Symmetry: D2
Subunit: 203 residues, 4 copies
């Protein structure tokens, strides 16, 4: 049974970049809905699993196939929002302060500067043509190299792709404050990105 994570900060602590009103809806409604949905999907799985254990028919297997989609969507929503709240911080807690050490060295070697990496990430975020996410990741299969990937809907990065920074590009992440001006939101969010958490995930 999963639960909404505690937040490290108050709803309004990321203003003016992300409003408190968005945070409260995003956290208490959207995220909570993925929590509930994920729990329901795993219960339904459990039941189907027992059922198939005693009656391993094609019909029952098809029934499981049906639930897989909800496990993926709600699991993805749950995990992605947990990641998101953890890589956000108010400036008083280090939000927007550039990373140090190994991550900073890697960013410098690959992208030239933090500014370049961020510019690339915002171009990726703008390029999500639908609902989705952008992730700065460490690829453990190619020598631990940084990349920026896009996912759609609540798809997430798994296995050898370690998420370092997750940025939400669903319209509900910004619409009440920015409406259609999503570029302004993509630009503004970096002032409250927690690069300390990014460095921790990198380690």
């Amino acid at each position: 049974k999963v639960t909404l994570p505690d937040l490290k900060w108050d709803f309004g602590a990321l203003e003016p970049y992300i409003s408190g009103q968005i945070n409260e809806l995003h956290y208490t409604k959207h995220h909570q809905t993925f929590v509930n949905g994920f729990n329901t999907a795993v219960d339904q799985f459990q039941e189907l699993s027992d059922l198939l254990a005693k009656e391993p028919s094609p019909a029952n297997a098809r029934k499981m196939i049906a639930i897989q989609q909800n496990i993926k969507f709600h699991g993805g929503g749950f995990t992605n929002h947990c990641l998101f709240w953890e890589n956000l911080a108010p400036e008083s807690q280090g939000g927007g302060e550039p990373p140090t050490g190994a991550l900073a060295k890697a960013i410098d070697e690959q992208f030239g500067s933090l500014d370049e990496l961020i510019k690339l990430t915002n171009t990726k975020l703008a390029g999500v043509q639908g609902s989705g996410w952008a992730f700065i990741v460490k690829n453990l299969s190619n020598g631990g190299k940084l990349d920026v990937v896009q996912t759609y809907n609540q798809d997430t990065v798994t296995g050898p792709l370690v998420p370092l920074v997750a940025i939400d590009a669903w319209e509900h992440a910004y619409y009440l404050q920015y409406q259609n001006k999503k570029a302004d939101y993509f630009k503004a969010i970096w002032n409250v990105v927690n690069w300390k958490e990014a460095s921790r995930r990198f380690d």
Copy 2:
């Protein structure tokens, strides 16, 4: 724990339309690989389910998201092939004979002939731009109306769409015999399609 279904015919019973060589590989290698993969994926999800119970973190949830792709692909392969073997028959068991009853009535009402429906399905099969399936389905949500749908890979039709005829368009279903001439296989398979089974599925709504 699922297993390969019993076949209603021997591997060579669909000759010359589908070779015995193909049927033997298709059943004993491909379908068996789906059976194994589905069993493994389901077991792994049980394991991760307990792990998530003990420690309901985003990391463990992430792992479950990883396993669902395998449950979907292998589950889909298992179930789709089961449907497939059940809607094929040799001519001695009614393969290639036209459907009966309400299904035939539906086909006449919607397509005007069985030939129109088969032509539509073959066009759908040719249109699968990859590995996939075509299904003739009964749509339970729109008053039980017949339609033809494509899926890719091992995706299947679920919910309100009841598969009546599954046709496999993965290359392994025909390559040894027809090679690149997939149109010839799509054309030839209708001689061994079991419309008796299709009628049954139509009438049952499952």
Copy 3:
């Protein structure tokens, strides 16, 4: 060069079901963005097509492939929003009024009633796990039968699937008013659905 269509009503004409603030953004910002994007994508096709004619290399073919996504997305945005505005109307213009004729008869035959069809469509809209659309369509390949289909992003219905009603399930279509309660928006929109335009599409299809 495609352009925004003229709306048959002012932005605030669908209240209280759809805010005028929403319609104004949805039309002037979002849809316009699809118009501009589609024009850009078609011109880029022209350019790459000449490029490919002069040098039909794998590299240039690879560029062609690259533009296809924008063609699909912006083309879809343009088309879908045109359909959308055309099947909405204020109640004063017959919004929410039930369909007549052949469409009405087919609906009764297939779904039992207009209410059952609307419920099915709302279930499909709720089922869009992401941004997307639902369409009520006439299927020309199976004898002209009605169906409800979902699409994601700006994917649309083509070929034998004639769109009769399109409903937008992207958050920008409802968020400023309904926020997370998308089900309330899905339920409310039918009060301004133009079923006469649906009937005309059905007969012409």
Copy 4:
């Protein structure tokens, strides 16, 4: 108008790793079908582009949307197979020989050896659940780093992802010889992979 490229080797030159029967069908039937399809899709799109120029309706835009799927699939099939033939060579033409220069340096930096890069690529290939490809790529957006990506069907790597080695995982690429034993084919193909072409692509930063 695209055309079937010239091969740099005879159909039976990659035996016993890939049969002559396979290469002949793969080239003269499958790839040719992509050539024909891509030319036809491009023609049809030009036609609809003209019609749209005179009649900019949502209906015509819907027809355009329908065509672009064919442009994607056939364009992909065409490009992916051109890549494929160019990164294959018989052993006497240097197939199976390790890459040199900048590519070799990058490979040893990120993977330690060609060994592990090939192992990674084989796991990716086995992981294609349907028809598709694996590509060893140079990512131009992250400082030029190597990676291995999967695509399904005739999807291809575009933009910052530059294909260095393309391996075909469609069943027609191996079934006549290996049937269901796809891992045997993925293992065997490396004996006739042309790393000199891969190095040329890495150095050039494009195909």
